[PDB]
């Protein structure tokens with residue numbers, strides 16, 4: 001079973017914790033990786049109901065289980081906040097342009 005399903009990508013709770021730990025470390029180090037500079041601020045224009053408060057940051061999560069190191073980020077992402085609390089798992093998959101949709 002999937003703890004989080006983004007389009008056709010299945011994710012376990014272990015996948016999301018491994019991702020978030022990598023992103024959070026980069027945020028503490030004031031560093032980024034990839035052409036689009038991740039992690040970077042996430043604005044919740046879509047009004048997703050997060051039970052953790054902002055500021056929020058996004059980091060790519062990959063379908064392969066590897067942690068993101070540069071190269072193609074895919075469409076999925078973890079969103080965490082300033083206290084290193086998980087907000088939710090989101091995707092561009094099924095969404096136009098600059099929208100996101102939640103992972104289910």
Ligand SMILES: [Ca+2]
Nearest residue numbers: 011012015065
């Ligand atoms: Ca996995």
